[PDB]
């Protein structure tokens, strides 16, 4: 558009932050440096809803931190942006951005730090992607999108389709 052009690179950067591959010799992984990069364009007190369930801020942990600690516990993700649209709403300094994506998840049994909880079971490591989930996402983001700091005021993230697996 005029003002929507910069939205696509921003969306791809945001999604790539959710799909971050952990990199590293040291005995225990750097959990906090990894997890604070997840969805890092979120603002500390952004409104966040995942599948209809809001993240509730506690005095100890703001919404962004809570989200990052929950997202950390998902298997490695891979999102593909499939559509977006956006409206600059006058007198707000914000875009509403409505986008869709497909997302799939690592089925290998390893978590995002490369570790598997298989000690009791009877058992290079590349991710083994499962089937595509559908996702619908709505963001309210600051008009000055060219910055990749904390610009997202709210995110509503909603699975539209979950494959049998």
């Amino acid at each position: 558009q005029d003002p929507t052009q910069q939205l696509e690179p921003f969306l791809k950067r945001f999604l790539a932050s959710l799909d971050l591959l952990y990199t590293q010799s040291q005995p225990f992984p750097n959990v906090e440096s990894y997890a604070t990069q997840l969805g890092s364009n979120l603002k500390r007190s952004s409104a966040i809803i995942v599948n209809g369930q809001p993240i509730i801020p506690s005095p100890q942990e703001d919404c962004k931190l809570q989200f990052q600690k929950k997202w950390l516990q998902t298997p490695l993700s891979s999102h593909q942006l499939t559509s977006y649209d956006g409206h600059l709403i006058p007198g707000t300094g914000t875009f509403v951005v409505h986008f869709s994506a497909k997302v799939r998840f690592d089925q290998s049994g390893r978590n995002r730090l490369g570790e598997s909880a298989d000690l009791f079971q009877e058992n290079n490591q590349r991710p083994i992607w499962g089937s595509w989930f559908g996702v619908d996402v709505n963001l309210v983001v600051d008009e000055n999108v060219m910055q990749d700091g904390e610009i997202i005021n709210s995110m509503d993230y909603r699975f539209t389709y979950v494959p049998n697996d």
Binding site: Q1, T4, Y84, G86, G93, T94, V96, S100, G134, S154
Partner: protein, 186 residues
């Protein structure tokens, strides 16, 4: 707020299926509407792929439209433009009264202007061709083409509603393949 949104959506969809001209009071000069098609969206398979023929020319899927002219031509601003977009969408029935369980919804605060965000997810039946054929005859307006099939679609729709009684500031409709399986089912 959760009840004020349930009522908004209930009345909206009644008129969206019946008389779309009756919705135009909700929109003002600065109000915005656009519709986007996501033909790649996941869905339960089991006639072939979905035919999006009525939707494609007006689709503002901004990953697929690169020229500034086309990007701005698919955005509707103000009552007149928005009403014309509404006339080019197939006529529908959303079965929200009988089967409200086909639908999911989030409602929360917009950061400014004392507004609320309402997002609805679900499906609809197409019951008739659009009033105005925006797909590119005596049976339809515009240039001749072979008959486009009507079919169910799934969708998501986001409203920013403000005090202004109620004014829709922003309205985005996403159209995608019908999925008879979805995570809020049963």
């Amino acid at each position: 707020s959760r009840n004020l949104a349930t009522n908004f959506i209930a009345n909206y969809l009644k008129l969206w299926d019946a008389n779309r001209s009756e919705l135009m009071i909700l929109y003002q000069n600065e109000s915005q509407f656009s519709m986007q098609v996501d033909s790649s969206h996941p869905h339960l398979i089991e006639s072939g792929s979905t035919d999006f023929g009525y939707y494609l020319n007006n689709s503002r899927n901004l990953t697929r439209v690169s020229s500034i002219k086309a990007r701005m031509a698919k955005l509707s601003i103000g009552q007149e433009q928005i009403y014309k977009s509404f006339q080019q969408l197939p006529k529908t029935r959303h079965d929200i009264i009988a089967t409200p369980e086909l639908f999911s919804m989030e409602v929360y605060k917009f950061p400014t202007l004392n507004g609320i965000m309402i997002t609805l997810h679900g499906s609809f039946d197409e019951v008739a061709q659009p009033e105005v054929d925006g797909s590119a005859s005596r049976y339809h307006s515009g240039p001749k083409h072979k008959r486009i099939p009507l079919s169910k679609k799934s969708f998501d729709r986001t409203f920013v509603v403000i005090p202004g009684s109620m004014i829709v500031a922003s309205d985005t409709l996403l159209i995608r393949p019908y999925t008879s399986d979805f995570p809020w089912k049963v």
